[PDB]
Amino acid sequence: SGAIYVGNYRVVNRHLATHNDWANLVWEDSSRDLLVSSTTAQGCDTIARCDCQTGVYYCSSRRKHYPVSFSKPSLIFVEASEYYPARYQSHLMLAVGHSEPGDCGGILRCQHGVVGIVSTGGNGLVGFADVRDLLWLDEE
């Protein structure tokens, strides 16, 4: 589990979105595993605006933050998980690292801020749903 809180926005994995998230929907995209809902309170996370390929992610299943290299956001074929079939996921970045289903929502961060959240795992790879292209999170 985990979210990003920027401005009046809450960013979560679409497959973990709550009723309250859907009842306050701003934007969602199944192909990215993302959903954004509106918040009453201001959040304090900063979204990275960059093309970094190194950062640190939180892995809840090891109680650890791991420094990783990660790939460019791309359309990647992902094996079946407990929450999606095998499919193409868009705007996904991979690193070599541990990722359980419960690790979804863990933050990947670089020097510029939050890059994205854990979305995929297996075969010794962790996949992150990029948010750096969602420039509208910075405004309105």
User: Shortest approach of Zn ion to residue 113 CB, angstroms?
Assistant: 7
Q: Does 56 bind Zn ion (CB under 5 A)?
A: no
In whole angstroms, what is the distance from residue 98 CA to residue 79 CA? 15
Select from 4, 6, 48, 131 the one that contacts Zn ion (CB under 5 A): 48
In whole angstroms, what is the distance from residue 77 CA to residue 61 CA? 24
Q: Does 52 bind Zn ion (CB under 5 A)?
A: yes
Q: Does 112 bind Zn ion (CB under 5 A)?
A: yes
Give the gyration radius of the chain's Cα atoms: 14
User: Shortest approach of Zn ion to residue 87 CB, angstroms?
Assistant: 28
User: Shortest approach of Zn ion to residue 52 CB, angstroms?
Assistant: 3
Tokens representing residue 15 in the block: 């497959």
User: Sign (positive/negative) of CA torsion 8, 137, 102, 59?
Assistant: negative
Q: Does 76 bind Zn ion (CB under 5 A)?
A: no
3-state secondary structure of 115: strand
36, 14 in Cβ contact below 8 A? no
Which residue, 50 or 80, is less far from Zn ion as judged by CB?
50
Annotation says 91 is catalytic: no
Q: Which positions lie near Zn ion, rule CB under 5 A?
A: 48, 50, 52, 110, 112
Catalytically annotated residues = 15, 33, 104
